[PDB]
Coordinates of all heavy atoms in Angstrom, one line a residue:
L1 N 140.7 5.9 30.0 CA 141.4 4.6 30.2 C 142.9 4.9 30.1 O 143.4 5.8 29.3 CB 141.0 3.6 29.1 CG 139.6 3.3 29.0 CD1 139.3 2.4 27.8 CD2 139.1 2.6 30.3
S2 N 143.7 4.1 30.8 CA 145.1 4.1 30.7 C 145.6 2.7 31.0 O 144.8 1.8 31.4 CB 145.8 5.1 31.6 OG 145.5 4.9 33.0
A3 N 146.9 2.4 30.8 CA 147.4 1.1 31.1 C 147.1 0.9 32.6 O 147.4 1.7 33.5 CB 148.9 1.1 30.9
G4 N 146.6 -0.3 32.9 CA 146.2 -0.6 34.2 C 144.7 -0.5 34.5 O 144.2 -1.0 35.5
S5 N 143.9 0.1 33.6 CA 142.5 0.2 33.7 C 141.9 -1.2 33.4 O 142.4 -2.0 32.6 CB 141.9 1.2 32.7 OG 142.3 2.5 33.0
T6 N 140.7 -1.5 34.0 CA 139.9 -2.7 33.7 C 138.5 -2.2 33.4 O 138.0 -1.4 34.2 CB 140.0 -3.7 34.9 OG1 141.3 -4.1 35.1 CG2 139.1 -4.9 34.5
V7 N 137.9 -2.8 32.4 CA 136.5 -2.5 32.1 C 135.7 -3.8 32.4 O 136.0 -4.9 31.8 CB 136.2 -2.1 30.7 CG1 134.8 -1.7 30.4 CG2 137.1 -0.8 30.4
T8 N 134.8 -3.8 33.4 CA 134.1 -5.0 33.8 C 132.7 -4.9 33.3 O 132.0 -3.9 33.4 CB 134.1 -5.1 35.3 OG1 135.4 -5.3 35.8 CG2 133.2 -6.3 35.8
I9 N 132.2 -6.0 32.6 CA 130.9 -6.1 32.0 C 130.3 -7.4 32.4 O 130.9 -8.5 32.2 CB 130.9 -6.0 30.5 CG1 131.6 -4.6 30.1 CG2 129.5 -6.2 29.9 CD1 132.1 -4.6 28.7
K10 N 129.1 -7.4 33.1 CA 128.4 -8.6 33.5 C 127.1 -8.6 32.8 O 126.4 -7.6 32.8 CB 128.2 -8.7 35.0 CG 129.6 -8.9 35.7 CD 129.5 -9.0 37.2 CE 128.2 -9.8 37.6 NZ 128.2 -11.1 37.0
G11 N 126.8 -9.7 32.1 CA 125.5 -9.7 31.4 C 125.1 -11.1 31.0 O 125.8 -12.1 31.4
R12 N 124.0 -11.3 30.3 CA 123.5 -12.6 29.9 C 123.0 -12.5 28.5 O 122.3 -11.5 28.2 CB 122.4 -13.0 30.9 CG 122.0 -14.5 30.7 CD 120.9 -14.9 31.6 NE 121.1 -14.7 33.0 CZ 121.5 -15.7 33.8 NH1 121.7 -16.9 33.3 NH2 121.7 -15.5 35.1
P13 N 123.2 -13.5 27.6 CA 122.6 -13.5 26.3 C 121.1 -13.5 26.4 O 120.5 -14.1 27.4 CB 123.1 -14.7 25.7 CG 124.2 -15.2 26.5 CD 124.0 -14.7 27.9
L14 N 120.4 -12.9 25.5 CA 118.9 -12.8 25.5 C 118.2 -14.0 24.9 O 117.0 -14.2 25.2 CB 118.4 -11.5 24.8 CG 118.8 -10.2 25.4 CD1 118.5 -9.0 24.5 CD2 118.1 -10.0 26.8
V15 N 118.9 -14.8 24.1 CA 118.3 -15.9 23.5 C 119.4 -17.1 23.4 O 120.5 -16.9 23.8 CB 117.9 -15.6 22.0 CG1 116.8 -14.5 22.0 CG2 119.1 -15.2 21.2
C16 N 118.9 -18.3 23.0 CA 119.8 -19.4 23.1 C 120.9 -19.3 22.1 O 120.8 -18.6 21.0 CB 119.1 -20.7 22.8 SG 118.3 -20.8 21.2
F17 N 122.1 -19.9 22.4 CA 123.2 -19.8 21.5 C 122.9 -20.3 20.1 O 123.5 -19.9 19.1 CB 124.4 -20.6 22.1 CG 125.2 -19.8 23.1 CD1 124.7 -18.6 23.7 CD2 126.5 -20.2 23.5 CE1 125.5 -17.9 24.6 CE2 127.2 -19.5 24.4 CZ 126.7 -18.4 25.0
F18 N 122.0 -21.3 20.0 CA 121.8 -21.9 18.7 C 121.3 -20.9 17.6 O 121.6 -21.1 16.4 CB 120.7 -23.0 18.8 CG 120.7 -24.0 17.6 CD1 121.8 -24.6 17.2 CD2 119.4 -24.3 17.0 CE1 121.7 -25.5 16.1 CE2 119.4 -25.1 16.0 CZ 120.5 -25.8 15.5
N19 N 120.8 -19.8 18.1 CA 120.3 -18.7 17.2 C 121.3 -17.6 17.0 O 121.0 -16.6 16.4 CB 118.9 -18.2 17.7 CG 117.8 -19.2 17.6 OD1 118.0 -20.2 17.0 ND2 116.7 -18.9 18.2
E20 N 122.5 -17.8 17.6 CA 123.6 -16.8 17.4 C 123.2 -15.4 17.9 O 123.3 -14.4 17.1 CB 124.1 -16.8 16.0 CG 125.5 -16.2 15.9 CD 126.0 -16.1 14.4 OE1 126.4 -17.1 13.8 OE2 125.8 -15.0 13.8
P21 N 122.9 -15.2 19.1 CA 122.9 -13.8 19.7 C 124.3 -13.3 19.6 O 125.3 -14.0 19.5 CB 122.5 -14.0 21.1 CG 122.9 -15.4 21.5 CD 122.8 -16.2 20.2
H22 N 124.4 -12.0 19.5 CA 125.7 -11.3 19.5 C 125.9 -10.4 20.8 O 124.9 -10.1 21.4 CB 125.8 -10.3 18.3 CG 126.1 -11.1 17.0 ND1 125.5 -12.3 16.6 CD2 126.8 -10.7 15.9 CE1 125.9 -12.6 15.4 NE2 126.7 -11.7 15.0
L23 N 127.1 -10.1 21.0 CA 127.5 -9.1 22.0 C 128.5 -8.2 21.3 O 129.4 -8.7 20.6 CB 128.1 -9.7 23.3 CG 129.0 -8.8 24.2 CD1 128.0 -7.8 24.8 CD2 129.7 -9.6 25.2
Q24 N 128.3 -6.9 21.5 CA 129.3 -6.0 20.9 C 129.7 -5.0 22.0 O 128.9 -4.4 22.7 CB 128.7 -5.2 19.7 CG 129.8 -4.4 19.0 CD 129.5 -4.2 17.5 OE1 129.0 -5.1 16.9 NE2 129.7 -3.0 17.0
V25 N 131.1 -4.8 22.1 CA 131.7 -3.8 23.0 C 132.6 -2.9 22.1 O 133.5 -3.5 21.4 CB 132.4 -4.4 24.1 CG1 133.0 -3.3 25.0 CG2 131.6 -5.3 24.9
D26 N 132.3 -1.6 22.0 CA 133.1 -0.7 21.2 C 133.7 0.4 22.0 O 133.0 1.1 22.7 CB 132.2 -0.1 20.1 CG 131.7 -1.1 19.1 OD1 132.5 -1.8 18.6 OD2 130.5 -1.0 18.9
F27 N 135.0 0.5 22.0 CA 135.8 1.6 22.6 C 136.0 2.7 21.6 O 136.7 2.6 20.6 CB 137.2 1.1 23.0 CG 137.1 0.1 24.2 CD1 136.4 -1.0 24.2 CD2 137.8 0.4 25.4 CE1 136.4 -1.9 25.3 CE2 137.8 -0.4 26.4 CZ 137.1 -1.6 26.4
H28 N 135.2 3.8 21.8 CA 135.1 4.9 20.8 C 136.0 6.1 21.2 O 136.3 6.3 22.4 CB 133.7 5.4 20.8 CG 132.7 4.6 20.0 ND1 132.5 4.9 18.7 CD2 132.0 3.5 20.3 CE1 131.6 4.1 18.2 NE2 131.3 3.2 19.1
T29 N 136.4 6.9 20.2 CA 137.2 8.0 20.4 C 136.4 9.3 20.8 O 137.0 10.3 21.3 CB 138.1 8.4 19.2 OG1 137.2 8.6 18.1 CG2 139.0 7.3 18.9
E30 N 135.1 9.3 20.6 CA 134.3 10.4 21.0 C 132.9 9.9 21.5 O 132.6 8.7 21.2 CB 134.1 11.4 19.8 CG 135.4 12.0 19.3 CD 136.1 12.9 20.3 OE1 135.4 13.4 21.2 OE2 137.3 13.1 20.1

């Protein structure tokens, strides 16, 4: 990645919002 990069992610929650599904995106160094 550098300045000007874009990370595109398309998805859908697996369960209804009332049950608080989570989404996690982690940018790692290794």
Side-chain angles (χ1 to χ4, degrees):
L1 304 171
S2 59
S5 295
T6 300
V7 184
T8 296
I9 300 159
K10 291 177 42 53
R12 191 186 298 264
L14 292 172
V15 299
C16 64
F17 276 17
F18 196 52
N19 291 351
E20 202 186 277
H22 283 39
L23 163 66
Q24 186 155 322
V25 181
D26 295 310
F27 288 60
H28 279 265
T29 58
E30 302 293 339

